[PDB]
Ligand code: HEM
């Protein structure tokens with residue numbers, strides 16, 4: 109059939125509009141163009157942006173889209189690391205992804221939840237002897253201690269503080285400009301070298317992590333040819349566990365926000381029926397902004413909706429806008445856990461990617477995230493009391509990630525006993 113012209117945003121480069129609008133950039137234009145797909149110019153080149161469940165399923169078609177060389181270098185050097193799983197395609201990707209999925213078994217997730225609970229207890233005891241407590245910063249430290257213990261990474265106290273700062277900077281810098289962006293580049297450089305040394309100690313026999321742990325599994329994994337991963341690559345992969353675990357602190361912020369803003373939803377949790385906590389956690393992941401979009405390159409020319417996708421074109425999948433799509437969800441722009449009662453598809457609810465864990469790039473740590481969020485919600489509701497003082501809890505849709513301006517201050521913390 110005839111090739112049609114995709115809706116097109118004019119201007120020599122539109123990256124500035126993405127920087128100004130953030131999470132809302134793609135959905136605003138899906139609305140104004142009356143199309144789930146449009147073309148623009150971002151980072152000096154043509155770009156295609158698309159959202160909704162059909163677009164998501166097409167984006168996850170690995171005959172049509174590849175990840176090699178898709179992410180901008182500025183994102184590789186902050187968020188991802190070079191030559192990690194995010195960069196791979198085909199059987200090489202499948203085999204690397206199996207390494208990540210191998211640490212996600214029932215017994216290992218139980219180990220994670222036990223650690224997470226203990227580290228919450230430790231933090232709460234500390235906060236009870238404090239006055240004001242900055243939840244985002246304290247939660248990053250909870251999650252850094254949890255990550256290192258679960259991963260088998262030995263850390264001294266000074267190393268905990270430094271890692272918490274540097275892992276934070278890696279994700280807080282990825283969509284930043286200027287001075288702030290470079291903090292994350294330097295943070296990544298420092299921890300890559302530190303983790304590389306540690307992996308060399310594992311391989312030399314001088315450190316002996318338990319067999320079940322990330323550090324053991326990633327240090328000893330062999331590729332499709334039977335060879336150990338390069339030390340640099342294995343370090344990037346370990347950081348691809350430690351960093352996103354720290355990042356759960358962003359979702360902890362939003363759990364606390366939701367408990368403060370929605371007392372009727374909090375009261376439904378006081379029952380002990382786990383269905384309510386499950387719905388609440390899912391709705392936090394659906395409603396609040398976090399990972400805006402993912403990127404791929406067109407692998408081979410193809411047609412969809414009458415439009416030509418040309419090989420090599422950078423393509424953005426709108427995660428935020430799909431999670432807020434009024435063609436998928438009833439009243440998408442309100443927080444309503446009841447929408448999940450006995451719950452859509454793997455392409456419609458995509459805060460941590462869509463599709464299949466093994467056949468695509470969907471987040472390896474989605475179950476970790478959900479389980480950590482459940483522990484955190486249980487702590488904040490059932491194991492402590494605190495006050496939320498008057499403060500600026502607003503969160504900007506132009507900042508990625510989006511953090512409430514006050515960083516969520518709590519006070520008068522008391523552990524229930
Ligand atoms: C804290 C909140 C998190 C969010 C919002 C999040 C979101 C995402 C998204 C959107 C992707 C990319 C999907 C794609 O490329 O198609 C991804 C990939 C990934 N995530 Fe997460 N994630 C989080 C936590 C975690 C955790 C806790 C872990 C590890 C325990 C983790 C490990 C990974 C890995 C290894 C990948 C790359 C998978 C691949 O390329 O095949 N993430 N995540």
Ligand SMILES: CCCCCCCCCCCCCC(=O)O
Nearest residue numbers: 279282283351352355398508509
């Ligand atoms: C490829 C688009 C980059 C988007 C900008 C990053 C803002 C969100 C931070 C996401 C962190 C998710 C977990 C992680 O990978 O550490």
